[PDB]
Amino acid sequence: GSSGSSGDTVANASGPLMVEIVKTPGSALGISLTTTSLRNKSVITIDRIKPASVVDRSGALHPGDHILSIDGTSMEHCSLLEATKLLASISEKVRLEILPVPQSQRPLRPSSGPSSG
């Protein structure tokens, strides 16, 4: 009579936003992150994206977004090196968990308009 707890191992799917990006197989896009301070701890964010890339051409990530997690990696006690390593360790789609920001608050939103490129 000990241990147990049979329900779910962390499951919300409401707070953080999963910004997936269908990149090339074993290929690097060019995502640049930039960590900063606050008061007691720091936070990993996005510095800038690469031009003519899957993230830029698609418009998934953006400079300034607050990354909450990546591929199941909490961005509460991580660094720039660790985070950058996660983006490189991708098979096809990058599991980037970003906070609901005004710049991006949808995994698959419509894109209408004459020009787009």
Side-chain angles (χ1 to χ4, degrees):
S2 68
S3 182
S5 268
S6 217
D8 55 286
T9 304
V10 188
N12 308 318
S14 217
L17 209 67
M18 315 193 216
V19 188
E20 268 160 35
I21 311 169
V22 187
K23 64 147 61 70
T24 9
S27 300
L29 309 175
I31 309 162
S32 315
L33 309 149
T34 172
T35 63
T36 46
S37 299
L38 269 167
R39 266 168 137 79
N40 272 297
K41 267 189 261 155
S42 40
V43 188
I44 311 98
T45 36
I46 311 179
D47 198 320
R48 243 170 221 69
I49 312 139
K50 231 237 185 140
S53 200
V54 186
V55 188
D56 202 81
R57 288 212 163 181
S58 196
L61 309 183
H62 259 254
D65 279 52
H66 289 27
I67 309 139
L68 301 161
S69 28
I70 312 177
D71 215 276
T73 314
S74 268
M75 290 298 108
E76 192 138 54
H77 278 267
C78 269
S79 310
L80 207 148
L81 285 175
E82 211 157 331
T84 307
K85 279 175 99 278
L86 295 168
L87 299 167
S89 267
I90 311 296
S91 199
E92 214 136 288
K93 62 174 87 107
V94 62
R95 215 174 138 79
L96 267 157
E97 237 125 282
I98 311 176
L99 177 87
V101 288
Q103 293 174 113
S104 293
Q105 221 177 93
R106 262 146 142 293
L108 291 144
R109 60 151 92 199
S111 205
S112 268
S115 256
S116 165

